[PDB]
Design a protein around this ligand. Structure first.
Ligand SMILES: Nc1ncnc2c1ncn2[C@@H]1O[C@@H]2COP(=O)(O)OP(=O)(O)OC[C@H]3O[C@@H](O[C@H]2[C@H]1O)[C@H](O)[C@@H]3O
Ligand SMILES: Nc1ncnc2c1ncn2[C@@H]1O[C@@H]2COP(=O)(O)OP(=O)(O)OC[C@H]3O[C@@H](O[C@H]2[C@H]1O)[C@H](O)[C@@H]3O
Ligand SMILES: Nc1ncnc2c1ncn2[C@@H]1O[C@@H]2COP(=O)(O)OP(=O)(O)OC[C@H]3O[C@@H](O[C@H]2[C@H]1O)[C@H](O)[C@@H]3O
Ligand SMILES: Nc1ncnc2c1ncn2[C@@H]1O[C@@H]2COP(=O)(O)OP(=O)(O)OC[C@H]3O[C@@H](O[C@H]2[C@H]1O)[C@H](O)[C@@H]3O
Ligand SMILES: Nc1ncnc2c1ncn2[C@@H]1O[C@@H]2COP(=O)(O)OP(=O)(O)OC[C@H]3O[C@@H](O[C@H]2[C@H]1O)[C@H](O)[C@@H]3O
Ligand SMILES: Nc1ncnc2c1ncn2[C@@H]1O[C@@H]2COP(=O)(O)OP(=O)(O)OC[C@H]3O[C@@H](O[C@H]2[C@H]1O)[C@H](O)[C@@H]3O
Lengths: 94, 81, 95, 94, 81, 95
């Protein structure tokens, strides 16, 4: 598992057998932290919709034996969108 | 692909919005959407295979008012009903 | 092993000899399900109709090669919809 | 793990070292299915609050090696309460 | 009981509502509540210890409008603000 | 092993030599945290302020005796509240 992917173009450039259906950036990356050595990645991604957005938080932790623990959570946020017009993205009023 | 697959009801009740996967790295991630009256139900799914062949799994779900997955083109999107 | 293909209580009672049910075990009614007993997974959506809307549950279970399981659950309230079980195919729609 | 507990009185009568803080029936059992042999239990519990209720779904699956997999989920339901005045409980209008 | 415990902020931001546990059977289940303006945040927690000493964990969270955990008596409850 | 006591990005960068951060890594600001590095667990609440409310995340991680981990996450929207970080103790309150 590559712990530092930030967009679908960087994913296709680093995973040789990646298969993507639909718009791979439907959930745009808001922020992410990872340590390849400590084996973890945490990210927030946002899908803009009519009148609000869908916010996803993701955690993945690699174990010493090579296995993984995973968690995901999701919520709807009214009248906000992720702004992707800057280098540092944020959620704000539509 | 699955010889003994059994489906109850509409197996596409949650229609696929997007998906990424890698068979070698052993993970898949998808978003699926069920259109209902006045809004839609959005499901996110992650599955990761481990080196010993076992799996880690996660799921999350939310309601989105006044949106439907629009399947009228090749690229689906969630938008105003 | 876990039966991954149950669709209602009557079927569970007929296939699980020691099943114990408290209350109405069809409170969360099956909307859709897919499963493979040999590949070892099931995914289902269930709906509990309530006053003014319904509660929707999505459920995933995956069997591992060593016979253990991975599991996930998620839940949301849906206003002004109910599962309709009056026809061959069930659906969520306006109350 | 006892897979068939239905109320806090039955839990105290079967678990010798059980410790309960607060009202142990804050989340009242709505429905439950379990198989001791297949090793699983699934339950819905409901906490009545002002103007609505909190609904919890719980799944626990025992593995061949004696370990467990667990999952939980929670949502708020407006203008409904669990009715406990009958033997078979239901969620309905407050 | 925990010698190296480190707490940041108010360690009781989520106040305990109820809890059940068994040290021998190896599980604990709790509900905790954070009072906010106009409502409260309700967290449910489960932890199960395995025979090999490892753990399974689960968490869930929801917002409840116009309720607070009432801590004015020995038995706490969620009720109208 | 996982550092279970991080409270902000500056502390993570100073204690995790290969940390990589995309975007503003304090987007979810720490509200409260408890951890024991020796017992192997951490529990935290983080808040992302947005227009008209905030997003609240609760996070749990537990280390197992074999060095592996169990994890859980949950998330909800809270209307008309923000985390206030202007004082010694942070709190969620009216915007
Ligand atoms: N809820 C999802 N539903 C469907 N598909 C998803 C979801 N979530 C992730 N994906 C796909 O996996 C790829 C890499 O994911 P990843 O390497 O495992 O880490 P990440 O933090 O989740 O994604 C960070 C960025 O990557 C880009 O492509 C992603 C997505 O195409 C995206 O623009 C992300 O914003
Ligand atoms: N949130 C729940 N709360 C309480 N109890 C639950 C829940 N969810 C499931 N149960 C009980 O387990 C039995 C078998 O479940 P299962 O075999 O593991 O598969 P499934 O997809 O979850 O349920 C498919 C159908 O089975 C029937 O009986 C179920 C339920 O009585 C039902 O009519 C289901 O609609
Ligand atoms: N909440 C559910 N409730 C009931 N059943 C479900 C759910 N979720 C998935 N299923 C069933 O599993 C099949 C394959 O699942 P899969 O191979 O494991 O990956 P996926 O990302 O979840 O689904 C990608 C697409 O597959 C199609 O059939 C699905 C569904 O019939 C669907 O149209 C999906 O849109
Ligand atoms: N979100 C919770 N928060 C705090 N505490 C909880 C929660 N959930 C469960 N508990 C406690 O465990 C005991 C047994 O739990 P159990 O044996 O593991 O199975 P169950 O289906 O979850 O609970 C079925 C019934 O048991 C009674 O006592 C429960 C509770 O005091 C209750 O009235 C339940 O309605
Ligand atoms: N939902 C998230 N989405 C994206 N990224 C996240 C999330 N959640 C955490 N991160 C990143 O991991 C780093 C270390 O996290 P961690 O060490 O594993 O502990 P923690 O309790 O989750 O975060 C405590 C503080 O750490 C700082 O940096 C964090 C974050 O940049 C932050 O200011 C936290 O407020
Ligand atoms: N979402 C959280 N965010 C930050 N920190 C958290 C959260 N949740 C828990 N904590 C911290 O762990 C300590 C012990 O946790 P614990 O021993 O593992 O069990 P518990 O049921 O979760 O908490 C029972 C009571 O303990 C007190 O201190 C807690 C908290 O400081 C609290 O007042 C609890 O009300």
């Amino acid at each position: 598992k590559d712990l530092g992917i930030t967009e679908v173009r960087g994913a296709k450039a680093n995973i040789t057998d990646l298969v993507v259906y639909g718009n791979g950036d439907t959930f745009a990356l808001l922020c992410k932290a990872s340590s390849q050595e400590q084996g973890w990645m945490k990210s927030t991604k946002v899908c803009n919709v009519y009148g609000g957005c869908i916010v996803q938080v993701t955690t993945q932790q690699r174990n010493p034996d090579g296995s993984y623990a995973l968690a995901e959570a999701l919520t709807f946020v009214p009248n906000n969108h992720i702004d992707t017009s800057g280098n540092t993205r944020f959620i704000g009023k539509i």
